[PDB]
């Protein structure tokens, strides 16, 4: 069947990926997502504003039929790295026939004093070394805002067999997280140096690296 949609469409507005705002080579984007668009009134008009000034460079995506018989309708705006990190507000205005007025949504970087992450690599526990795989740990703490990217490398090559916890509010209002890279024990015993890479606005060049090996 088809659902009733008495309130018409709803809007969700999302920030750029943290790494995208911090590396000049990459392309950071704000994404305005409209859901519960009916088949009968499926057109969505987007206006975009940066600190109240209209901009015209958004990409209009083809609408997407959802399994519940609604459309998902999306507009994506590329932003300037400096504007996002300087705290400009990005406003998405969504117009649709099923609504009494336009829905407006705003997003910016979290406000408040940036704080530099402290980064610490921790070897496997003596008790894990009986296993075939071991856990290399990266602790990242004392950072604000929560927007951060974390990756691993060895010998100039990405190491991808890792999981990172979400950011966690610490008692001083800063954030921390942990990243766990699982490696074959042979590779650790051989003396390979692994590195935990952290990207955050408050780090010099938005980048730091801490390394870890057998001793």
């Amino acid at each position: 069947p088809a659902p009733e949609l008495l309130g018409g469409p709803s809007v969700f507005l999302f920030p750029p990926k943290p790494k995208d705002t911090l590396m000049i080579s990459r392309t950071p984007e704000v994404t305005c997502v409209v859901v519960d668009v009916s088949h009968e009134d499926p057109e969505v008009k987007f206006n975009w504003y940066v600190d109240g000034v209209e901009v015209h460079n958004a990409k209009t995506k083809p609408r997407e039929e959802q399994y519940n018989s609604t459309y998902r309708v999306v507009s994506v705006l590329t932003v300037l790295h400096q504007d996002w990190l300087n705290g400009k507000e990005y406003k998405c205005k969504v117009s649709n026939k099923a609504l009494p007025a336009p829905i407006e949504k705003t997003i910016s970087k979290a406000k408040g004093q940036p704080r530099e992450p402290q980064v610490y690599t921790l070897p496997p526990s003596r008790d894990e070394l009986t296993k075939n795989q071991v856990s290399l740990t990266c602790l990242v703490k004392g950072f604000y805002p929560s927007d951060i990217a974390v990756e691993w490398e060895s010998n100039g090559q990405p190491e991808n067999n890792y999981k990172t916890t979400p950011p966690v509010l610490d008692s001083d209002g800063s954030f921390f997280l942990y990243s766990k890279l699982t490696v074959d024990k042979s590779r650790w015993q051989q003396g390979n140096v692994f590195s935990c890479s952290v990207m955050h606005e408050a780090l010099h060049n938005h980048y730091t690296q801490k390394s870890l090996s057998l001793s």
Binding site: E4, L5, L6, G7, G8, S10, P100, A101
Partner: protein, 149 residues
């Protein structure tokens, strides 16, 4: 110069009907009035003639999901206050709360008018309503009600 319904504040797409005992913003009209589906331009001053010239009667058309309607905004002690939480296109509204001074005063499972039969001094403050249209949380703008003796 009678309004049918009595609501002088209305919402875009509301039907209004006007009765005589016309000059829309002191200016001539199409016929000698039924508003089939209001818009912001249908707002303003209204007078009538065919008899004498009538008093001014104001009509506010508003844009929104909800509109808190009353017959007037100033009430004598012991007068009845009739509030209506009017939804755009009379869209089904549920879990409706009428607030006074930022506090929930009366709650309804389904949209219902909030009738106060005997006004007291304690009934002064800013009022608005809110509720759910499907699963969307919507609210009206506030209005001030004052009570005198």
């Amino acid at each position: 110069v009678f309004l049918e319904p009595q609501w002088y504040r209305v919402l875009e797409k509301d039907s209004v009907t006007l009765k005589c005992q016309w000059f829309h913003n002191e200016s001539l009209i199409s016929s000698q009035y039924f508003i089939d589906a209001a818009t912001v331009d249908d707002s303003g001053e209204y007078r009538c003639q065919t008899s004498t010239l009538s008093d001014p009667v104001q009509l506010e058309v508003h844009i929104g999901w909800l509109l808190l309607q009353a017959p007037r905004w100033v009430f004598k002690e012991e007068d009845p206050i009739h509030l209506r939480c009017h939804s755009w296109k009379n869209t089904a509204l549920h879990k409706v709360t009428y607030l006074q001074n930022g506090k929930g005063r009366k709650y309804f499972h389904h949209n219902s008018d909030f009738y106060i039969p005997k006004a007291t001094l304690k009934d002064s403050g800013s009022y608005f309503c809110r509720g759910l249209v499907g699963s969307k949380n919507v609210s009206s703008e506030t209005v001030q009600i004052t009570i005198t003796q």
